[PDB]
């Protein structure tokens, strides 16, 4: 590995510097090297891995949507460049899914965290695809839902975030707005019903995500 000679702690340190510098490609490479040391990631380290790669693919997805939009309005130049960006985007998704399967997927919260990630990056592959991909995303999301409902409180931010992204999967990908609405409403309603389970160290993230669930419900209705 390109990061094989660097100590794990230095890779984490440099991932944090790259974040401060908004160098998310470097940040993703440092975290990949840390994962490849073979040790589990702490909560803080999981977030760094998520922040790093989600920013990389985010920029690629935004670029792909622009080029795809230009392509629909319509020489081979637009298609060719859209394909170039598409292939690069698929490469990053394959890298993340490879890390998840090879190192990270094996604590309920951590298991849900990584299964949510797998559903996200299969969802990103489905946006440009197929169905062999969507069923992989659903299977990952669904398994993550099963664990979170049994093991984590209804206000837990990982549980809430999983349901939000899973509901987006139902709406945008599966074209199933009914399942997207019921899930988002059930998630929000069950968080409010057991609002007392908010945690002192994560309530800001819980309330943030609860509001984002409400925002999507407002749009979808």
């Amino acid at each position: 590995g390109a990061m094989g000679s660097m100590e794990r702690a230095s890779l984490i340190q440099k991932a944090k510097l790259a974040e401060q510098a908004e160098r998310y490609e470097d940040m993703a490479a440092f975290m990949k090297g840390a994962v490849e040391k073979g040790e589990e990631l702490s909560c803080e380290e999981r977030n760094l891995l998520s922040v790093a790669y989600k920013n990389v693919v985010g920029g690629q997805r935004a670029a792909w949507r622009v080029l795809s939009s230009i392509e629909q309005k319509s020489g081979p130049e637009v298609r060719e460049y859209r394909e170039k960006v598409e292939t690069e985007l698929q490469g990053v998704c394959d890298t993340v899914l490879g890390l998840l399967d090879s190192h990270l997927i094996k604590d309920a919260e951590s298991r849900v965290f990584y299964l949510k990630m797998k559903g996200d990056y299969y969802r990103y592959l489905a946006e440009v695809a197929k169905k062999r991909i969507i069923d992989s995303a659903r299977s990952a999301y669904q398994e993550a839902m099963d664990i979170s409902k049994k093991e984590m409180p209804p206000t837990n931010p990982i549980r809430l975030g999983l349901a939000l992204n899973f509901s987006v999967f139902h709406y945008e990908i599966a074209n199933s707005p009914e399942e997207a609405i019921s899930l988002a409403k059930t998630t929000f309603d069950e968080a409010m019903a057991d609002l007392h389970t908010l945690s002192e160290d994560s309530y800001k993230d819980s309330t943030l995500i609860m509001q984002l669930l409400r925002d999507n419900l407002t749009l979808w209705t």
Binding site: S50, V51, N55, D120, G161, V168, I209, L212, N216
Partner: peptide, 5 residues
């Protein structure tokens, strides 16, 4: 409109 980060 997924999870921001």
């Amino acid at each position: 409109p997924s999870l921001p980060x």
